[PDB]
Design a binder for this molecule. Structure first.
Ligand SMILES: *SCC1=C(CS*)C(C)(C)N(O)C1(C)C
Ligand SMILES: [Cl-]
Ligand SMILES: [Cl-]
Ligand SMILES: [Cl-]
Ligand SMILES: [Cl-]
Ligand SMILES: [K+]
Ligand SMILES: [K+]
Length: 164
């Protein structure tokens, strides 16, 4: 297991535009296109992202290219973020993947909204952090994914992604 495999499990793979869990047009492995309700706006964003006129359909290779860019940008963003970098740097590689997963799903600003949990993680109070992480909109709206991510933070293992 690694961050790519983990996010592939949590995000799926779809080659046509679809709506994510929040109703927003997305493609590939969780590549958000736009929050606009306009499908034509989403199709325009897709063509810009891929560099050709796609009409809403891409190949697996193209989905994986966007995914690699998105993972890279998430990590680089964490490192540029004065709130998230110290916590990231304090963690082992498995827990780092859980943090990247959260940032991929909700963005840097959203994860910075988890400061109470982030402090507990930085202090390596793993069970306390896990309890606090679940007191969130995130957990309520995507509980199965959140439970996997939280187990990864609690244990520092890949156990939640083993049967999957
Ligand atoms: S998210 C709140 C913050 C933490 C965790 S306790 C810390 C890394 C120490 N950081 O400076 C804050 C104030 C942003
Ligand atoms: Cl892009
Ligand atoms: Cl296709
Ligand atoms: Cl708590
Ligand atoms: Cl879920
Ligand atoms: K998804
Ligand atoms: K995403």
């Amino acid at each position: 297991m690694n961050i790519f495999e983990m996010l592939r499990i949590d995000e799926g793979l779809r080659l046509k535009i679809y709506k994510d869990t929040e109703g927003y047009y997305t493609i590939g492995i969780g590549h958000l296109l736009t929050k606009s309700p306009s499908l034509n706006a989403a199709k325009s964003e897709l063509d810009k992202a891929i560099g050709r006129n796609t009409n809403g359909v891409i190949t697996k290779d193209e989905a994986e290219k966007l995914f690699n860019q998105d993972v890279d940008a998430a990590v680089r963003g964490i490192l540029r973020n004065a709130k998230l970098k110290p916590v990231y740097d304090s963690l082992d590689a498995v827990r780092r993947a859980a943090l990247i997963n959260m940032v991929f799903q909700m963005g840097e600003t959203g994860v910075a909204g988890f400061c109470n949990s982030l402090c507990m993680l930085q202090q390596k109070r793993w069970d306390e952090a896990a309890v606090n992480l679940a007191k969130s909109r995130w957990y309520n709206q995507t509980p199965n994914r959140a439970k996997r991510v939280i187990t990864t933070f609690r244990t520092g293992t890949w156990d939640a992604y083993k049967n999957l």
